Amino acid sequence: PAILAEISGIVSFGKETKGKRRLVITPVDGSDPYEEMIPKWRQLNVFEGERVERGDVISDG
Amino acid sequence: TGSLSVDNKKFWATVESSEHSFEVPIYAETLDEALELAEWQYVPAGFEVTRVRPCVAPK
């Protein structure tokens, strides 16, 4: 991963205790949950409630 | 000792204190579940999370 969604679906954001960003992706590609805590300073894949594909968004890695 | 369910998947969370900075694995069943704990479990202890990296790698 780099600047991408590990899974295809609707990537959304949630609570951030300080200067973070809750990365909760809603998979459409399959029943494979993928959630992580990417900081807000990080160039994110895209905004919340946005449809993206596995690996394909901004930067693959 | 506080949270940490199981270690079916290894999740990494680097935490930063007033001066110290370290990395500690998160133990939970689900991704989001660990995501909750990484922040929610460490922040009341005075530890501020810096960044995390889940390491699933399908078995």
Domains and CATH numbers, chain B: 1-59 (3.10.20.510)
Q: What are phi and psi of B45, to 5 degrees?
A: -95, 0
Which of the residues A18, A35, A43, A44 would you substitute to probe the B interface, choosing the one with the greatest number of B C-beta atoms within 10 Å? A35
Which of the residues A3, A37, A41 would you substitute to probe the B interface, choosing the one with the greatest number of B C-beta atoms within 10 Å? A37
- Structure-block tokens of residue B56: 């699933």
CA–CA distance, B11 with B38 (Å, rounded to integer)? 9
CA–CA distance, A56 with A18 (Å, rounded to integer)? 28
Residue by residue, DSSP assigns B13-36 as EEEE-SS-EEEEEE--SSHHHHHH
- Structure-block tokens of residue B11: 């999740």
Cβ(B53)–Cβ(B23) below 8 Å: no
Q: Which amino acid is at A12?
A: S
Do residue A24 and residue B32 have CB atoms under 8 angstroms apart?
yes
- Structure-block tokens of residue B16: 């930063």
Residues in chain A closer than 8 A to B39 (CB atoms)? 15-17, 20, 22, 37
Beta bridge partners of A23: A13, A36
Beta bridge partners of A3: A59
Q: Which amino acid is at B31?
A: L
Closest alpha carbon to A20 in B16, B26, B23, B28: B16
Indicate the number of domains in chain A. 1
CA–CA distance, A34 with A28 (Å, rounded to integer)? 12
CA–CA distance, B44 with B47 (Å, rounded to integer)? 7
Q: Beta strand A9-14 with A50-52: parallel, antiparallel or unpaired?
A: antiparallel
Residues in chain B closer than 8 A to A4 (CB atoms)? none
SS3 state at B44: helix
> CB contact, 8 Å: A29 with chain B?
no
The residue segments making up the domain with residue A57 are 1-61
Q: How many other β-carbons are positioned within 10 Å of the β-carbon of residue A1?
A: 15
CATH label of the domain that carries residue A2: 2.40.50.100
